[PDB]
Write a protein that binds this ligand. Structure first.
Ligand SMILES: Cc1cc2nc3c(=O)[nH]c(=O)nc-3n(C[C@@H](O)[C@H](O)[C@H](O)COP(=O)(O)OP(=O)(O)OC[C@H]3O[C@@H](n4cnc5c(N)ncnc54)[C@H](O)[C@@H]3O)c2cc1C
Ligand SMILES: Cc1cc2nc3c(=O)[nH]c(=O)nc-3n(C[C@@H](O)[C@H](O)[C@H](O)COP(=O)(O)OP(=O)(O)OC[C@H]3O[C@@H](n4cnc5c(N)ncnc54)[C@H](O)[C@@H]3O)c2cc1C
Lengths: 391, 391
């Protein structure tokens, strides 16, 4: 078989890229290691930047989002016995963010793809990439036990952190930047009303806590935990008690608790690889970079990489301007580094780090006081949180 | 002998406090360990916030400053092959800073004090403080070999980092926060025209460099150096060559060099003690806190502590409101911590730290790019640099 663009991975990155390309008349095949059900089982992110919202509308997959998504104009930060609200709309010049689950976004895209008849091969095992620096690269994989070959012009690696695509680039061509945090986030999804209409990030002496939501009757909470903890050590009862201990009393008393629909621990990490391409292979999303979830940039960076790759492929196919594809990494990296800096800052000011001396604790508190108390300070948070403009 | 306020130390803190109190009719005696000449030999700071400028005018010691001081509306930051100017006046809402040497400020104050006839005892050896928690505290010292006693109501410890006053508070009553940096600054004073009309802070791979001035024919430069270096290892020739290697070529080529008038190495440190008082003793300036010079806040924080202490003593003496003095530490610490946070930030983004991994170097560069490229980012630098308003 042959196609124009081969896409490895059927998470939001690959599905979004595949839908945009399909609509533009550029044929693409998506290869996914897992089953549709397995992909839809992942909870993950819940905050979308306007750029991604617009991209979804452009891919023609925004009906349910427009209907069910919640537009937020602010967010709160609680620390040292106080709650500070950042008016994102006012401080960013009218921009806002939309709360709509990643699971929902993925489901919307999967439906759209199924309906349009574009090619998607689930359970594509042992995917391998070949002749990346040739005129005609190709992908091989096994279906049922048979090894198939897919010829193409370009390959988009949208296979996440553990995908085969980043592994397929000669190690000596890549420059990796990484930072692992000494803690993870224990998240819990519950069919209960959110404790607030906006998100509450809380820096507490016992550790970080985050109150989020998915809808009016679905909440998503997180608590910072050491990397040594295992989810089976945390009953729902234990989680709720801990969450409450980390929240302002007035918030903790309004909290409606209930049984978890999902509960898991995800460790924190920062990761960037440079460049993000090699020959006919272009990396996008988690395959190229990782940000701690504190700033809600993961899914959002996948969106901007895809937007950039899609527009460059359009120039290549529609206008015969293939040379522009060489600029992919430079364009994406500029946005990526700024989002990595913000996520890192967000993480350092909201979490409790092990082995912190007195000076550092005081500086962490002063960072909060300064940034949340100055108009210019609030503005730096807001503009970064709503998301810097696409290039 | 007896006085109302005993002041330990004749650097800018004590002299400024003594002049303000004198003018307000509150008698004060200043005790200094060194000679007038030794004090005037210190070069140190060169940038004054408007608050300090106004305080000097209030103490009636601003003629020469108004005449010789240089008002700066901006400052530049050079990094990764580029020079970025921060328009302080525009970004701070019309505020500026004044370049007038600390040596000059000290000389102006010493003259004013000498002329008004207020008491100053130089070469006051082995100063000791007594009955700090009594109704009537006192200071003892040796002059000529004779041990004298000075009775007073209050004692202001303006004796710097190594003064006897902070040492006189029961250690268990103080909470210290400290951070030592792995480098020092090698400074050089030269009788040459400045390379720029505004300051240039430079982050270079070889290390930090700063181009400052004292007048139109007097420059002050600094270069970051390891704590293992000794000034005798640095000839003028070696310094100039190193400075040039750390500056943008166009700047380096305009540089007029010459023999040093002064040259020395000063290590970097952050230090805060809480509280800043004990009984009838109040600490001010370097006796209570230290900031790395990167943000030019040392002399400026001494000024705000003195302004706060002076105004509280005025209420106590003029209005009989002695209770207000209990609020001294709380008021000062709020400003101190914000200035410590800024000086720390300034230091971390402009210096080259030993043992920095790839991720951190990239984040340091991105911090610069973000802050110097965003209106909100520039504003956070400007408002902090001109100095936050006195409380
Ligand atoms: C465990 C986890 C929890 C997260 N939680 C949060 C959160 O709480 N908040 C937040 O803001 N962000 C969170 N994120 C970030 C998340 O939103 C990601 O940024 C987002 O899923 C990235 O989307 P993709 O790049 O499409 O990658 P994804 O990882 O979502 O998808 C990649 C796809 O490639 C497939 N694939 C893998 N290897 C393959 C191969 N060899 N061949 C074929 N297919 C292959 C995978 O099966 C997967 O379907 C989380 C991420 C993870 C990994
Ligand atoms: C070596 C050095 C270099 C510096 N360089 C810079 C720079 O380049 N840029 C910048 O922005 N800042 C710099 N600073 C900071 C500087 O500006 C200080 O913040 C400022 O001098 C503090 O003023 P005071 O609190 O009055 O203390 P000071 O240290 O100036 O004065 C305290 C006085 O108390 C006296 N004293 C000490 N112990 C005594 C005792 N037991 N009895 C009696 N008298 C006693 C001392 O002799 C001294 O005269 C530097 C500081 C130092 C120490």
């Amino acid at each position: 078989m042959k196609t124009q663009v081969a896409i490895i991975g059927a998470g939001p990155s690959g599905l979004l890229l595949g839908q945009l390309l399909h609509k533009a008349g550029i044929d693409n095949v998506i290869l996914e290691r897992q089953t549709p059900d397995y992909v839809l089982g992942r909870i993950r992110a819940g905050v979308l930047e306007q750029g991604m919202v617009d991209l979804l509308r452009e891919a023609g997959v925004d009906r349910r989002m427009a209907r069910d998504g919640l537009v937020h104009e602010g967010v709160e930060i609680a620390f040292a016995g106080q709650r500070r609200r950042i008016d994102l709309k006012r401080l960013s010049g009218g921009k806002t963010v939309t709360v709509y689950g990643q699971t929902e976004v993925t489901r919307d895209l999967m439906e759209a793809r199924e309906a349009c008849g574009a090619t998607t091969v689930y359970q594509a095992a042992e995917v391998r990439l070949h002749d990346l620096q040739g005129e005609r690269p190709y992908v091989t994989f096994e279906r049922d036990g048979e090894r198939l070959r897919l010829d193409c012009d370009y390959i988009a690696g949208c296979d996440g952190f553990h995908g085969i695509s980043r592994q397929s680039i000669p190690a000596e061509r890549l420059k990796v930047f990484e930072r692992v945090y000494p803690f993870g986030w224990l998240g819990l999804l519950a069919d209960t009303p959110p404790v607030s209409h906006e998100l509450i990030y809380a820096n507490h002496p016992r550790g970080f806590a985050l109150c989020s939501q998915r809808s009016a009757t679905r909440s998503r909470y997180y608590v910072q935990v050491p990397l040594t903890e295992k989810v089976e050590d945390w009953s729902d009862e234990r989680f709720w008690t801990e969450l409450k201990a980390r929240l302002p009393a007035e918030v903790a008393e309004k909290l409606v608790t209930g049984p978890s629909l999902e509960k898991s621990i995800a460790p924190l990490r920062s990761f960037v690889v440079e460049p993000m391409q090699h020959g006919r292979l272009f990396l996008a999303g988690d395959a190229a970079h990782i940000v701690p979830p504190t700033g809600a940039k993961g899914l959002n960076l996948a969106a901007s990489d895809v937007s950039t790759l899609y527009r460059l492929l359009l120039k290549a196919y529609r206008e015969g301007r293939g040379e522009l594809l060489e600029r992919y990494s430079a364009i994406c990296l500029r946005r990526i580094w700024k989002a990595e800096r913000f996520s890192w800052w967000m993480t350092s000011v909201l979490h409790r780090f092990p082995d912190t001396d007195a000076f550092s604790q005081r500086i962490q508190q002063t960072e909060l006081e300064y940034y949340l108390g100055s108009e210019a300070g609030l503005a730096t948070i807001a503009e970064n949180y709503v998301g810097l403009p696409y290039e």
